[PDB]
Scaffold this active site. Structure first.
Site, PDB file in Angstrom:
ATOM      1  N   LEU A  13       0.645  -1.269  -0.238  1.00  0.00           N
ATOM      2  CA  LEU A  13       0.082  -0.076   0.025  1.00  0.00           C
ATOM      3  C   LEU A  13       0.968   1.251  -0.015  1.00  0.00           C
ATOM      4  O   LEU A  13       0.378   2.319  -0.185  1.00  0.00           O
ATOM      5  CB  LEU A  13      -1.016  -0.095   1.133  1.00  0.00           C
ATOM      6  N   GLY A  14       1.942   1.134   0.673  1.00  0.00           N
ATOM      7  CA  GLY A  14       2.985   2.234   0.586  1.00  0.00           C
ATOM      8  C   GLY A  14       4.184   1.974   1.122  1.00  0.00           C
ATOM      9  O   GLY A  14       4.385   0.826   1.863  1.00  0.00           O
ATOM     10  N   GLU A  15       5.333   2.707   1.164  1.00  0.00           N
ATOM     11  CA  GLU A  15       6.576   2.623   1.639  1.00  0.00           C
ATOM     12  C   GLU A  15       7.408   3.988   2.194  1.00  0.00           C
ATOM     13  O   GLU A  15       6.827   4.974   1.944  1.00  0.00           O
ATOM     14  CB  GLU A  15       7.615   2.198   0.280  1.00  0.00           C
ATOM     15  N   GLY A  16      10.073   1.932   6.133  1.00  0.00           N
ATOM     16  CA  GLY A  16       9.597   0.744   6.155  1.00  0.00           C
ATOM     17  C   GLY A  16       8.483   0.544   5.181  1.00  0.00           C
ATOM     18  O   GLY A  16       8.564   1.251   3.962  1.00  0.00           O
ATOM     19  N   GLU A  17       7.399  -0.091   5.286  1.00  0.00           N
ATOM     20  CA  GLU A  17       6.145  -0.666   4.529  1.00  0.00           C
ATOM     21  C   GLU A  17       5.084  -0.782   5.035  1.00  0.00           C
ATOM     22  O   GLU A  17       4.564  -1.361   6.274  1.00  0.00           O
ATOM     23  CB  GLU A  17       6.880  -1.680   3.303  1.00  0.00           C
ATOM     24  N   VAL A  18       3.893  -0.517   4.227  1.00  0.00           N
ATOM     25  CA  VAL A  18       2.639  -1.097   4.538  1.00  0.00           C
ATOM     26  C   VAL A  18       2.021  -1.995   3.737  1.00  0.00           C
ATOM     27  O   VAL A  18       2.162  -1.591   2.266  1.00  0.00           O
ATOM     28  CB  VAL A  18       1.609   0.512   4.851  1.00  0.00           C
ATOM     29  N   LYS A  33       1.847  -2.270   8.991  1.00  0.00           N
ATOM     30  CA  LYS A  33       2.917  -1.315   8.971  1.00  0.00           C
ATOM     31  C   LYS A  33       4.180  -2.005   9.466  1.00  0.00           C
ATOM     32  O   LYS A  33       4.038  -2.396  10.690  1.00  0.00           O
ATOM     33  CB  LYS A  33       2.732   0.314   9.709  1.00  0.00           C
ATOM     34  N   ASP A 115       2.099  16.625  10.609  1.00  0.00           N
ATOM     35  CA  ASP A 115       2.484  16.295   8.996  1.00  0.00           C
ATOM     36  C   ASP A 115       0.931  16.064   8.228  1.00  0.00           C
ATOM     37  O   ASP A 115       1.277  15.038   7.433  1.00  0.00           O
ATOM     38  CB  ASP A 115       3.448  15.253   8.959  1.00  0.00           C
TER      39      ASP A 115
HETATM   40  C1  HK1 Z   1      -2.035   3.964  -2.408  1.00  0.00           C
HETATM   41  O1  HK1 Z   1      -3.433   3.237  -2.162  1.00  0.00           O
HETATM   42  C2  HK1 Z   1      -3.603   3.148  -0.891  1.00  0.00           C
HETATM   43  C3  HK1 Z   1      -2.778   3.519   0.407  1.00  0.00           C
HETATM   44  C4  HK1 Z   1      -2.888   2.829   1.437  1.00  0.00           C
HETATM   45  C5  HK1 Z   1      -4.093   2.263   1.684  1.00  0.00           C
HETATM   46  C6  HK1 Z   1      -5.160   2.026   0.636  1.00  0.00           C
HETATM   47  C7  HK1 Z   1      -4.611   2.286  -0.643  1.00  0.00           C
HETATM   48  O2  HK1 Z   1      -5.431   2.205  -1.830  1.00  0.00           O
HETATM   49  C8  HK1 Z   1      -6.609   1.223  -1.430  1.00  0.00           C
HETATM   50  C9  HK1 Z   1      -4.362   2.180   3.335  1.00  0.00           C
HETATM   51  N1  HK1 Z   1      -5.067   1.514   4.129  1.00  0.00           N
HETATM   52  N2  HK1 Z   1      -4.381   1.857   5.392  1.00  0.00           N
HETATM   53  C10 HK1 Z   1      -3.360   2.619   5.028  1.00  0.00           C
HETATM   54  C11 HK1 Z   1      -2.336   2.975   6.261  1.00  0.00           C
HETATM   55  C12 HK1 Z   1      -2.915   2.883   7.704  1.00  0.00           C
HETATM   56  C13 HK1 Z   1      -2.092   3.559   8.597  1.00  0.00           C
HETATM   57  C14 HK1 Z   1      -1.007   3.896   8.284  1.00  0.00           C
HETATM   58  O3  HK1 Z   1      -0.336   4.483   9.513  1.00  0.00           O
HETATM   59  C15 HK1 Z   1      -0.622   4.219   7.074  1.00  0.00           C
HETATM   60  C16 HK1 Z   1      -1.186   3.756   6.101  1.00  0.00           C
HETATM   61  C17 HK1 Z   1      -2.966   2.709   3.744  1.00  0.00           C
HETATM   62  C18 HK1 Z   1      -2.294   3.333   2.689  1.00  0.00           C
END
Ligand code: HK1
Length: 265
Positions: A13-15, A16-18, A33, A115
């Site tokens: 979902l994102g970059e 550690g990493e999620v 996370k 932030d």
């Molecule tokens: C880039 O797309 C996404 C990014 C993300 C999500 C869903 C996404 O697409 C459906 C998502 N759900 N929870 C979290 C998330 C939850 C807590 C946190 O500290 C950091 C990220 C994300 C990132």
């Protein structure tokens, strides 16, 4: 019940990493996370609000920390902003209402995010805004005593000018300012400056009230009257959240509710 504690990491979902994690038994989706962090866990344990990403818990497998957080299927607010366009004004108003509800909550419990930006503002299945990432967050009020901040953090385009000019500053006006930069991005699809400093031509133009220039040119006079009260250099003169909630554009009927199923005759 066997295997209910087993999760499968199905996508980044994102970059550690999620990572998007799906429960083996229930198929419940959560965001995990994989990682300062001790403070992040402690701040997340205090949070319970409809516009703040839910914390389910944490686990540590040796050197790696696993934070179990809310999966927001609507993704980021950032991906709702069309570059150089923004989004329809009633959508931005509804997201801004929800951003305020979340920030009021955090401030009421003495937490400052530090932030706020559209990359951190996530959307659930019903497009409800949820504030995320408490990695830079801190306690600014404890035992009804306010502590002034001095640490420089955030993201330059979203940082309040007092953070670049003053040694110490109040926490709440800093989060209000970043919310005003988010509102600008939502209505104009562009950030007004690289940083809020006198060396920045775009920042000096705003202070000189040259609203005939971009991004202000794309913003209607009613939301732009609100941005004039938020993006005030002096943090002591800057509008507070109680006064934002009394603003004309903030109370302007614009958006219909989510279209419910209907049949005729
Ligand atoms: C880039 O797309 C996404 C990014 C993300 C999500 C869903 C996404 O697409 C459906 C998502 N759900 N929870 C979290 C998330 C939850 C807590 C946190 O500290 C950091 C990220 C994300 C990132």
């Amino acid at each position: 019940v066997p295997f209910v504690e087993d999760w499968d990491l199905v996508q980044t979902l994102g970059e550690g990493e999620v990572q998007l994690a799906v429960n083996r038994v229930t198929e419940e989706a959560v965001a995990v996370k994989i990682v300062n962090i001790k403070k992040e866990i402690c701040i997340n344990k205090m949070l319970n609000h409809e516009n703040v990403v839910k914390f389910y818990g944490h686990r540590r497998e040796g050197n790696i920390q696993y934070l179990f957080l809310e999966y927001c299927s609507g993704g980021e607010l950032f991906d709702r902003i069309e570059p150089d366009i923004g989004m329809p004004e009633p959508d931005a108003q509804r997201f801004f209402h929800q951003l305020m509800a979340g920030v009021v909550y955090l401030h009421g419990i003495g937490i400052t995010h530090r932030d706020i930006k559209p990359e951190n503002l996530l959307l659930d299945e019903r497009d409800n805004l949820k504030i995320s990432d408490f990695g830079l967050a801190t306690v600014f009020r404890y035992n009804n005593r306010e502590r002034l901040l001095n640490k420089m953090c955030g993201t330059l385009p979203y940082v309040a000018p007092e953070l670049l000019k003053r040694r110490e500053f109040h926490a709440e006006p800093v989060d209000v300012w970043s919310c005003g930069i988010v509102l600008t991005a939502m209505l104009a699809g562009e950030l007004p400056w690289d940083q809020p400093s006198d060396s920045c031509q775009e920042y000096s133009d705003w202070k000189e009230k040259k609203t005939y220039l971009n991004p202000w040119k794309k913003i209607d006079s009613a939301p732009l009257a609100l941005l004039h009260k938020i993006l005030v250099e002096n943090p002591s003169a800057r509008i507070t959240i109680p006064d934002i909630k009394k603003d004309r554009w903030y109370n302007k009927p614009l958006k219909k509710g989510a279209k419910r199923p209907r049949v005729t005759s």
